Design a protein around this nucleic acid. Sequence first.
RNA 1: GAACGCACAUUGCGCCCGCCGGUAUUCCGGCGGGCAUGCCUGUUCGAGCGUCAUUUCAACCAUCAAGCCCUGGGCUUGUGUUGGGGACCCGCGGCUGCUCGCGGGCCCUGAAAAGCAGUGGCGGGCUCGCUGGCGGGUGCCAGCCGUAAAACCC
RNA 2: AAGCUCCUUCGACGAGUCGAGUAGUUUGGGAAUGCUGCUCAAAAUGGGAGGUAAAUUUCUUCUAAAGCUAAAUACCGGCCA
RNA 3: UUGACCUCGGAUCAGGUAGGAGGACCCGCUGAACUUAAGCAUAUCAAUAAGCGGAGGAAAAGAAACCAACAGGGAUUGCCCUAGUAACGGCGAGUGAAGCGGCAACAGCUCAAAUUUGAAAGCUGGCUUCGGCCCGCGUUGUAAUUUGGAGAGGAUGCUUU
Lengths: 183, 184, 185, 85
Amino acid sequence: GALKYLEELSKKKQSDVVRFLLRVRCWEYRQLNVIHRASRPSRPDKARRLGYKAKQGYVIYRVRVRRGGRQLKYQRSLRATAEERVGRRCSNLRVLNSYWVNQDSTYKYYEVILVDPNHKAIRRDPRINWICNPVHKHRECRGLTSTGKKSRGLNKGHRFNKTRAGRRKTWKRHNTLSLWRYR
Amino acid sequence: FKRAEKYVKEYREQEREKIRLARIAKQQGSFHIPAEAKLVFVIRIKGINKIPPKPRKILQLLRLRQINNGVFVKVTKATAEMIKIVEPWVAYGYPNLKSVRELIYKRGYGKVNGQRIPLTDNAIIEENLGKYGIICIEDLIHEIFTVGPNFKQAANFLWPFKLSNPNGGGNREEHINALIRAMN
Amino acid sequence: MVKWPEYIRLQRQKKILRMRLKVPPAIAQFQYTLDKNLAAQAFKLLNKYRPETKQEKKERLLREATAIKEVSKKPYTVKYGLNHVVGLIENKKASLVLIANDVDPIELVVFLPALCRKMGIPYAIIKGKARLGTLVHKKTAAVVAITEVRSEDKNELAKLISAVKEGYLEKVEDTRKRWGGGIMG
Amino acid sequence: ALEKKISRALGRGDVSNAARLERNANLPEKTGKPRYTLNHIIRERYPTFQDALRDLDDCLSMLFLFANLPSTTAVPAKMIARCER
RNA sequence: GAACGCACAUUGCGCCCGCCGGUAUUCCGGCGGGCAUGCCUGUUCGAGCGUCAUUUCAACCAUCAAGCCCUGGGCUUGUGUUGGGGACCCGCGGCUGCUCGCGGGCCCUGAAAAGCAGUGGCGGGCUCGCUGGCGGGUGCCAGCCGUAAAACCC
RNA sequence: AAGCUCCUUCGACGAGUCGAGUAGUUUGGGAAUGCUGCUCAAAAUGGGAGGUAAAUUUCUUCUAAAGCUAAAUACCGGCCA
RNA sequence: UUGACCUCGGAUCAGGUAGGAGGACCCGCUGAACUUAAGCAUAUCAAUAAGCGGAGGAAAAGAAACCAACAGGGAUUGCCCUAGUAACGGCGAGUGAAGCGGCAACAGCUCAAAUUUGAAAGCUGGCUUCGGCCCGCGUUGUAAUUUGGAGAGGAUGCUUU
């Protein structure tokens, strides 16, 4: 229904309606805390396509990240920094995903969808309870979110030869002298 | 400030009351009730804001103006016509012995010299009336219930009763007892 | 002098910012809301066609269960839910659409007046998502729609539709296109 | 909190939910029974029966007067009938 | 000790709910159970020149009564209608007459609408005259009647 | 509740993301090998990547920007043998 | 005056959760210098050591915006050869893959974009006599159906629990 229209609107971010709304929200977020709880997603189509559900156990957290370089560029993405800061504030939650919501001259604002793995509404649902397993503790710190998957070069093809299965594992495999018993 | 829907509603009620008054005035006032005189309690309820002149005259002749006022009234042909005129504002019917007894014992006041006193002493009611045969409060209790010649002076003597507003408690013959039971 | 709390100041400054900027027409159209009388008439009809609460639904289902232990027509209710109402508008099933004016992510409803204009469904902007919520037994409701009714008040619905299309749609027709706000003066 | 809920139901336009909440409230005008359950307090205050008679002096005096007293908003009619009975 | 009522280099110092002993409802000592932070769900309490709703636009005639006649079938009284327009058919009152009234038959229209308003009185109201009483005018009457006079009012 | 068949009915596929310019970093890899920061900022018979001198970009092969998943693999640490 | 909604707070309220350790192996971030080139700075060392953050019995990766140019293959991982080849380089030092082929192991799926709309059909808590009762979440969307080498809806006739 309406989410198709919101997706098409989100695809025009310099149009008058979206530019006006982005500026008013940026003003409000700038005067709030750096990491603050958001009652509902400001972009429901984007949160919904990333796995956010209006169910107890799902939380949005807006976070501002200072933009710019670290001429040494920070190889870590600003979106990854956002998830890490939110993941430390909410150390009892699992970072599901995050998405861009706004940008200013000095900050870039992102919203992080988190999931409570101890809520019974999450532990009983076979679509989300994979995050209840202890192998998903702090996915944002190990490059296991979407930004982490992009920055580690985890894609198929000849362009991603040295990084598609892990860069350091590939380097250790190529630098290992294999001596068999019968040589 | 008053809106137009109130004006049109008012006019519709006044018009409907006007045709109803013309209907009862034209038609011969004979109720489906035997010619023997009866006794009915009458309690008037909130209804229409604006009262036509003949209903307000009948209510003044039956002394019902204030909030939740009740009066016992005889049933003959003239009183039947009077109470049929003011039907939408009043509710009437046959009372019970405990109803009138409790209603006068909890709320029974008297009128003399244009002022309203509580019934405090039987000496007070004997100074107020004197010589028509009443000697106590039980006397006007069975004078109200059992028919007799002393209805008019006793009814003029008693102030009508200001019953407390209920919290949720046509013509009927026996549900009025539950009404005054919850009205008290 | 005295110091005000922070969130109260944010609320009042968001008031002044949303009312004194050059608002785009799609957002500035939401400042024009139904009057008291027409909203009262519309809510009289929609209160005639409210859905059932949980208690009445379980009570009715228990009644059918014991009737089976020991015939109906299609129910007619006020239709709610944003995606459901959008699907009803697109398929030209809705007859009248009432859109709330205080949806906090206002993108969820900015396209709705234009959509109702395009498909030809009469619409009106009402004051309060909490009012629409009380009607559908929820806390809030972004939009409600009525599609079809029982026979005994079809005429009334028609008059109400005509009322809004004579009482709200032509008073909005010229100002629905213009930018709002400004501090000229 | 239940008074808050019945006020919420009255303001929300739900007549049936209002009826359900006032049934659950056991409000002492449609019943005549005391609003709260006072078993444990009168058990702890009166350990035996002769103290109950000693206070029943004043209790029964209050009730006989109250049965001969009329009804207002704070003192409804149904528990006056219960006083009488 | 991540170390978690406060300090910590002292076997020290506080708050809430209880107990025991020694002069003991008042004094002292000891004991039992609790009192860290961030965050999630729920509960409860509280703020906001954030925000909406709050002056019935409802129902209410008889869902059948009363009286007749041959006690088995009917009869009689119960006066209850939105406003317009039309390239028609009449009837009856009026007018010297055209025509105008009252009543029908045939259509059309969203509970639609752009001057055309004229028939005589009785009462009450307002107004102005004469010495409470007597007389007339009135685009006043959310008051009656139909020209003859009432009803109603007090 | 479920699978299949048929068709004068339909068939929604992820945007500050691709991409362009530029500065670092990295790679055997200027179709920048990948990543990141800044500026600008998309599409819908669309988009990505390849093949081809072959007569014009003919053809081939897949669907990015959401997510889960055992086994074969590693192992100076843990419980043992 | 009263009651909703929204937003922001308080509570020694109820139920939970995180921190530290270990760290051989694993996933990220950050990141040298000696040395070689008989000097040395590009390069090498080395995307290593040290430092910081985060898991498990494995982790990671993973069901093609892939490889290929075929008579085609068909998620990921690892072994063998490919191959010291291609490619890049004070073209010096040197650096240095991948497709195919043989093998080990093999397993496929869940959402978002749809109106259940003839019925929020969904779920967390509290009370329990444990059987079913309340408050709340939620329509700014919780169940069912569907996931593009698909699918839906009707019709149809078999076959399944």
